[PDB]
Paper text:
The HYZyne-ADO adduct isolated from cells has lost the hydrazine moiety of the probe. The most likely mechanisms for the implied C-N fragmentation involve nitrogen-centered radical generation. Thus, the initial step is likely to involve coordination to and activation by the metal center, analogously to the mechanism by which the substrate is oxidized. To capture the anticipated initial state of the HYZ•ADO reaction in vitro, we first purified and crystallized the Fe(II)•ADO complex as previously described. Thus, the Fe(II) crystals did not capture the expected prereaction complex. However, attempts to identify conditions that recapitulate covalent coupling to ADO in vitro were unsuccessful, and we posit that a reactant is likely to be present in vivo that is needed to oxidize the drug to initiate its decomposition.
Author numbering: 4 to 22, 41 to 73, 77 to 144, 146 to 228, 241 to 269
Write the structure that this text describes.
């Protein structure tokens, strides 16, 4: 057989996908990465499925760094029971993720964009609970709530591109869950490529209003060591 570990493979293919007979192009490369990810079971990373009140000093979610180049990041997000990763964007990024244990809800949205043929400004009479300050009203943007399914390790991988399902919210459902995440290019808060947060305003794909909000006071994510086979 003589092959590298499945995680070494994924990392190879993510590098090929995001940087003599003709080699793959972007679509075939993205479909193969998707293929490699679907096979990924929790035990291939030596991730024991977790289960089971948390002290205000304990992170609601944790992160295991597997690998990072300028083309992609590769890691695992792990949500303790009841937590959730708030609604955030991925500015100009592709992304793939694969739930390893437990279950999650993902809600996939997008801000309307006149490049896709849709027409984006808020009616001034529009009213929401809670009401909106002046600086807030100037910052709301139209979006679309595309999906809200909940996924388990049986489901396929979840994909995102610069222009679709680029905003999402992950809720740990019925206990703790964890997922492998690929992001390309990786975030860079120093290169003006940050992870921005949003809430949906409250006055079946529907036009919704989104507001950008700071990172929630009680949401943070901490490193924790990675038990699986090492990359390269
Ligand atoms: N990244 N933020 C944070 N970092 N460390 C501890 C924290 C404890 C409570 C709320 C936020 C926290
Ligand atoms: Fe994300």
């Amino acid at each position: 057989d003589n092959m590298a570990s499945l995680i070494q493979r994924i990392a190879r293919q993510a590098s090929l996908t995001f940087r003599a007979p003709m080699q793959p192009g972007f679509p075939e490369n993205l479909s193969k990465l998707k293929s490699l990810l679907t096979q990924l079971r929790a035990e291939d990373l030596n991730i024991a499925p977790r289960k089971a009140p948390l002290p205000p000093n304990l992170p609601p979610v944790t992160y295991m760094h597997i690998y990072e180049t300028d083309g992609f990041s590769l890691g695992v997000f792990l949500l303790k029971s009841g937590t959730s990763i708030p609604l955030h964007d991925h500015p100009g990024m592709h992304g793939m993720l694969k739930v390893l244990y437990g279950t999650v809800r993902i809600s996939c949205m997008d801000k309307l964009d006149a490049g896709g043929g849709q027409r984006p400004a808020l009616p001034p009479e529009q009213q929401f609970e809670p009401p909106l300050q002046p600086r807030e009203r100037e910052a709301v943007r139209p979006g679309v709530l595309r999906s809200r399914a909940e996924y388990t390790e049986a489901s396929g991988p979840c994909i995102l591109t610069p222009h679709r399902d680029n905003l999402h919210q992950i809720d740990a459902v019925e206990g703790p869950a964890a997922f492998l995440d690929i992001l390309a290019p990786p975030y860079d808060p120093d290169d003006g490529r940050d992870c921005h947060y949003y809430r949906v305003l409250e006055p079946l794909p529907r036009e919704v209003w989104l507001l950008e909000t700071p990172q929630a006071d009680d949401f943070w994510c901490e490193g924790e060591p990675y038990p699986g086979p090492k990359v390269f």
